[PDB]
From a paper:
Pyruvate kinase (PYK) is the last enzyme in this pathway that catalyzes the production of pyruvate from phosphoenolpyruvate (PEP) and plays a crucial role in controlling carbon flux; however, while S. pneumoniae PYK (SpPYK) is indispensable for growth, surprisingly little is known about its functional properties. The overall structure of SpPYK, which consists of four protomers with three domains, shares the structural organization of archetypal PYKs. PYKs require divalent cations for activity, and they are either K+-dependent or K+-independent depending on the active site residue being a Glu or Lys, respectively. This residue is Glu93 in SpPYK, and we found that both Mg2+ and K+ are necessary for the proper function of SpPYK. In contrast, only a modest activation effect was observed upon G6P addition, and the kinetic profile remained sigmoidal. These results demonstrate that FBP is the primary allosteric activator of SpPYK.
Notably, we discovered that FBP in SpPYK binds to a location distinct from the FBP binding site in human M2PYK, which has garnered significant interest in recent years in the context of oncogenesis. Upon FBP binding, the effector loop (Ala482...Thr492) swings outward and destabilizes the Thr455-Asp456 interaction. This interface rearrangement is accompanied by the formation of new side-chain interactions including hydrogen bonds between Ser389 and Asp393. In SpPYK, the C1 phosphate is located at the effector site pocket and forms hydrogen bonds with semi-conserved threonine residues (Thr407, Thr409, and Thr412) located in the short loop region preceding the Cα2 helix. The fructose ring and the C6 phosphate point toward the C-C interface, with the latter making contacts with polar residues at the N-terminal end of the Cα1 helix (Ser382 and Thr384) as well as His411 in the short loop region and Arg491 on the effector loop. The fructose ring does not directly interact with SpPYK residues; however, a water molecule is present in our crystal structure that is ideally positioned to form hydrogen bonds with the C2 hydroxyl of the sugar ring and threonine residues that also interact with the FBP phosphates, likely contributing to further stabilization of the protein-ligand interaction. We show that the FBP C6 phosphate in SpPYK does not occupy the same space as the FBP C1 phosphate in M2PYK, but instead positions itself where it interacts with polar residues close to the C-C interface. Our genetic and biochemical data emphasize the critical role of effector-binding residues identified in the FBP-bound structures in mediating PYK activity.
Author numbering:
A (entry chain D): 1 to 21, 34 to 94, 106 to 117, 136 to 501
B (entry chain B): 1 to 25, 34 to 94, 108 to 118, 141 to 162, 171 to 177, 183 to 501
C (entry chain A): 1 to 96, 131 to 161, 170 to 177, 185 to 500
D (entry chain C): 1 to 17, 32 to 96, 109 to 122, 130 to 176, 185 to 501
Write the structure that this text describes.
């Protein structure tokens, strides 16, 4: 019984066992988050340096060979960043001069948006904001400041970020989560690097963190390969009771576009410290599966928590069960999609087959992962083994709902792709004799040009 | 545009030209006539054995075999068995023989004169056929008058038998005993429902039979005349659910027996038979013995063709409720999906027995269904399934590309042209595949 | 079991006794109309379920029409039930050519048009030099400038309003203008209460269907001529699309022509005629019509009774097979939302009767738009609005005293229902009214009450 | 814009100022202004005396806030109070060991292969052998005491339970949540106390904490007046990954029954020691409102947190956003209910009017509060003003979805309840001139059994 929601697990020091408190030891430890249900590790280049990142990547390539399973490599960029008080205390506040881009009536928030300073006056002397306090609270050395609803001219791509992804593209990554995507352009420029440097295979998840990115969700979905729902920044930058509705609506739109969405931040946050999750958190990751998410993500829980292995297995088991109730309660609705291509109508016909019968497995023989993404779109009640013929495409499919990618030789004009499909499934022990599978391919290899053939086969 | 609903035309004198003189005033003359019913959209000729001798039926079936040669199209051959058979308000009268309750009605001449038995009968309103509604009278499940006729038919070469006055599975099974004992298992059996006992046992009759003939004449006398609309909707639904074929019969373009144009109730009634889900519509008297036989076929074909353009909006069958009971079904379902997802011009099934062509027809895709079959008897046996166009082809070799043969037979048929998308289903590889197991979406070159 | 689908029975010589002799007995014409004998012939059609009589002003002079309407006013008193009076206009016409208003059609019949003869059985193709194509006169797809209202129709409608009619059925409606011109006669002469049914009978009438329904009080599908003027195999699609639309408009539809035609000669209808009446009801029609079958046929009483039982049986299956859908309606007024809530109530429990205290019949029309699964008793306060309700689906009109501001209309409602013989005790009814009387502007209260 | 989803706030030291009261009265007072609808006194963290004066404190809180609220008492209910491989032992013996509630021999009920979870389902002791002769247990360590999936005959009515139920009924309460309900009888011998005392008007909420209570859900719902989903204990008694399944299915069965349902546990949990909620917490609160819950519960977040007023104002914000997405995402579907009574069917028409037109308010003239409970079940798109004529059913409606309980003098047989209906709502500040409202009542008053008539009126 396989887990179909993918897990994106952030890495950090928690798994890195430093001289007993060291590669092959902590590679044998992250190879355990792989066996536990992690499909992609996140490297947040906001909390490390290239020397620390470049190392923690060669050590995961070690764990893949320990565990036998491969995983995806995702770089998260850093992107635009910016004494206890009591109410009414009118004060003020001081590399871009954001002076004329924040206006009166805005709100300046410090630390997880925990202290509000409404800007009441435009002091123009020392270029300062005459603000005042709305609630008692702190300002600590170096904590996040968000000025919501403002459109501060941050670069489409900050070169701090430019250098970061360029280093990732040369170690060997598969995805880039772009932080603070406000327009399609913030995506296009990271795209222009992936093609310039010869890495068209990389997939871009835009992170939606503020109102600029929600009011542009369409044109961003169009330009990106996925959406990461960075709820943290979004839950400061827009009303905190609107991220449940914005999350339901993002998962639906992104599924409609045939792309991947990842639901992020705070999913098992207690389990950073304590060894068990609140039932508010088991509710959350469960509901993300019913809203249609491709993948659930661990941030702090996996990177710098006491229980890194525990929060993967936890998510894994919640995800595993919540998949069992998508028939009854599922919110995605494939029956409303326009089938906009021959491969997509085929993907529909496969969903129909799994609804009509007990299909154990769908197999697709796919060069670029297109029919695998499209089958995944329709969320069949069966797992999708995607036989592809190049590791980059294989790794590129590891966040798609239900997809199990697997390398095999590109087939010649003279070999039953249908026996190959049965053979590779059984080798993987995903089907036992008498199981029914749905195999799709473009046949005959040579004249096919797209997936064009659906076959129902019972395993010998 | 191809007529999906099939027409069963009852044969008789109205087209048979005897010594140059028409009916009511020579097989080559009558063959050029029958050739015109065929191009007009007759898919199957009916031979009602209830009115005719064995000399007559033999000679007509002669005439249509020539008609196919003239017409360049084949049709099916249907034998209608005859089977079981038999004053003013207040006159008191008796009649002479255990199955008739004192309370039953007797009706002489086509259910118009009413004898309500009281011990002895009494008239109720102001060698004839008699009905006794709501009685389980033990007519032989297999009569002998019929037993001889059926054997006489299978002799000549027939594809269907319509069993008059079915009321239990026994009445069909014993006619199916005769077909697989003469080595014509290939013959398909329509169970005419005509009375309450038929309707009460309709499920077991559907199961035994290959299809129902909704026999509305007798059925109008035997059940209350205002429930046959209700029965017609519920029989078409159930037969369809059982992957079988339902003919809707008698009185359809009635006044076209005498006048050149149909009443607006008649047009409405053919029209609604399609919307309810009929596989076929039937002309009885209208084409057997009537002044405008070809105009009756042409009118029904024109009506049938329109009503199918509205099956999506108005249509009553609903394939989403069906349970796919075999791997061939879930692929029939998956074909219907394909035709819903994009503009598909034709379904092509390569089919040894026509099983696959029937499950596809069952699902009623929005596309015609070209059936590529390898013997004349499977071919003719598919001519009453909704939307199936039977086309004889050479059995594909172990090297032939059957998706190519599907395209070439369809372009030969003139059912497709360069640009059209088609769905093609097959058993691959040929011979070793136990059932249709492959679906292809092919663009026509 | 009250028949909720109303019937329109055309009257004619078939029910009329002329000196002991029935219609067709040798020497029946130029005799003495036995009016009291003819009145209890007619009176039995009324009991058998005829809800309104059609006087077809194409096959009668003004005196014979005037006399028959008299006989029907008697028949009511025998039957102890009242019916509506319907005038069917002659309309624009051409016959073998004689044209109405002696018009010259020559400058607007283009070439490539058809010319049909006798019930559309023989075709003539304009090349008028015209060729025969196969072995009354219609000219499909033309816009012959027939006056929006001729004069013979003007005089027919006026004679009829004088006698006292409740409905007019306007022949060959091509646009709203044909309707608004008869609506002006009706208002000009005091008869603003009269209701107009447009007969859609041709391509321009169908092309203009929306604006016509907007002008009229409802539609008479006259499938006869419609099937000569448009491709015969469309009449079903048009029947279904007109019923759905006239219902979305909360107006009345009548399905008509050849419905039980075999019964005009032989005494039992064919299977396709029983089919046709059944499907009309399942389609959504308020009303089924008889023409020849009841006017000059050998079994007018039987054809009425047959239509009634098909209609009574068909209605019991509207819940399954029924084509109309009151769920997609937009409720455009507070009375409609009350109509909606009545219909919801008759769906949650068994309701044997809905009652409405209606001054104008509005609430009655809006309730019957929603096709609740009960009967509708309309208690109205004059014979004009009572009779005017008589072709609305499921509506039983009954005249009662206008309630006073010191009256329980809910007890009035129960008392009248028990008087009519529709309820017994323990039955559940929905009652609807504007309370308090003389202060409520509109039907604003519903109540569920045990008899 | 009023709030329809009710809040149950648990009171504790956190709002109270020796214990003063007039100072504690004006903390509790703005909890009511925030949205707190019913106060919960968990009678397992305090004696009869202290919890007595807190109920005295809130009723003057009521009269400074200018709104009345409800009184819920949670029984202590049944209880058992007391690294890998360690083969320890634990004893069934009493007064030696387990502090079984009211003392019991729990031996011949806990079979081998069960599981003894000490310290909040923290530690796991897999029972491996039974010492039939001694009667103790032989366990083996795996990774308060809960023993899942066993029918321990816990005191169906302990006198410790019997004691505090009677002190509440004397002090003026409204609801009793009954802990660890496992059969119908656990509500009967507490309802038999209420009818006894002359307090049949009080309503009982079965707290479902264990598996027996989930196997017996139907007959308990039949016997109780509501369910409190105690996701605290439930997460330990059943597999933690199914409490979101069981929560969704509980709320459905409870709302089909026409009874109240409360989502409790861990809901705004971080809002105890931190000032803003996790994004998994807000999604949790949000989802239970889409699930169709009548009320949402704060425990320690208002009983002993740093931010009790803020926990209620935030929960009040999430409830009023989720309520506005009920016509789109709502899991409850009233179109499937059978309409059993003539009051159900009148409630069904009120629903109809709120979907046929803009209905600002539905008003019920009710005495039992029945009609207001049938209307609430069908969840009309509008608030419910329930007029009833005594503070002893006025209080009991305060946990029903959407209903604003308001008291006035019972009407005379010579009046139009409708006029007084329009008159309360205008005084109540819920409607202005032109508002369309739906009034339901039984007429004529003094000779009419059930709720009888429905009227549509536009506010004078
Ligand atoms: O059916 P569509 O959307 O036109 O996709 C067809 C395209 O996808 C491809 O078939 C790639 O498909 P796979 O990567 O799934 O094998 C291309 O050859 C082809 O051009
Ligand atoms: O898939 P099902 O319904 O079990 O039926 C399969 C059977 O019908 C057949 O497929 C025949 O099908 P066709 O005649 O339509 O090719 C047999 O080969 C097989 O025994
Ligand atoms: O609710 P609506 O459609 O605006 O109807 C309002 C009209 O209905 C009427 O009550 C007519 O109603 P009744 O004839 O049914 O009594 C008028 O007085 C009123 O102006
Ligand atoms: O639910 P039912 O069967 O209509 O019964 C209605 C019940 O509610 C009551 O009408 C109470 O109604 P209220 O809501 O006005 O208090 C009782 O008279 C009656 O027993």
């Amino acid at each position: 019984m396989n887990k179909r929601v993918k897990i994106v697990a952030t890495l950090g020091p928690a798994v890195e066992i430093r001289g007993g408190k060291d590669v092959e030891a902590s590679a044998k430890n992250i190879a355990k988050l792989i066996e536990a249900g992690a499909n992609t590790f996140r490297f947040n280049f906001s909390h490390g340096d290239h020397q620390e990142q470049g190392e923690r990547m060669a050590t995961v390539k070690l764990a893949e060979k320990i565990a036998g399973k491969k995983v995806g490599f995702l770089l998260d960029t850093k992107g635009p960043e910016i004494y206890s008080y009591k109410t009414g205390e009118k004060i003020r506040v001081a590399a871009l001069d954001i002076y004329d881009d924040v206006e009166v009536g805005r709100q300046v928030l410090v630390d997880d948006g925990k202290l509000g300073l409404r800007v009441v006056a435009k002091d123009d002397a020392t270029r300062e904001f005459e603000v005042e306090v709305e609630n008692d609270g702190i300002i600590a050395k170096q904590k996040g400041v968000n000025i919501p609803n403002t459109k501060i001219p941050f670069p489409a791509l900050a070169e701090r970020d430019n250098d970061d992804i360029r280093f990732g593209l040369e170690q060997g990554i598969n995805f880039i989560a772009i932080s603070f995507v406000r327009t399609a352009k913030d995506v296009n420029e990271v795209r222009a690097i992936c093609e310039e440097t010869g890495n068209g295979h990389v997939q871009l998840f835009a992170k939606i963190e503020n109102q600029q990115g929600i009011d542009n969700l369409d044109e961003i979905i169009e330009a990106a390969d996925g959406i990461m729902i960075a709820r943290g920044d979004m839950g400061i930058e827009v009303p905190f009771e609107m991220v449940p509705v914005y999350q339901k609506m993002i998962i639906k739109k992104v599924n409609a576009a045939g792309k991947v969405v990842i639901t992020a931040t705070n999913m098992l946050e207690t389990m950073t410290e304590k060894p068990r999750a609140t039932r508010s958190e088991v509710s959350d990751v469960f509901n993300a599966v019913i809203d249609g998410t491709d993948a659930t993500m661990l941030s702090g829980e996996s990177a710098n928590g006491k229980y890194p292995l525990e929060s993967v297995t936890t998510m894994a088991t919640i995800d595993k069960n919540a998949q069992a109730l998508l028939n009854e309660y599922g919110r995605l609705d494939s029956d409303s999609f326009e089938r906009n291509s021959k491969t997509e109508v085929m993907a529909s016909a496969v969903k129909d087959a799994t609804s009509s019968m007990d299909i154990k497995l769908v197999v697709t023989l796919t060069k670029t992962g297109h029919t695998a993404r499209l089958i995944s779109k329709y969320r069949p009640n069966a797992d999708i083994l995607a036989l592809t013929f190049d590791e980059l495409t294989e790794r590129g499919l590891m966040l798609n709902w239900g997809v199990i990618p697997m390398l095999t030789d590109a087939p010649s004009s003279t070999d039953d792709m249908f026996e190959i499909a049965e053979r590779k499934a059984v080798e993987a022990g995903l089907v036992e004799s008498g199981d029914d599978i749905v195999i799709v391919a473009g046949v005959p290899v040579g004249e096919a040009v797209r997936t064009n053939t659906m076959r129902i086969r019972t395993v010998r």
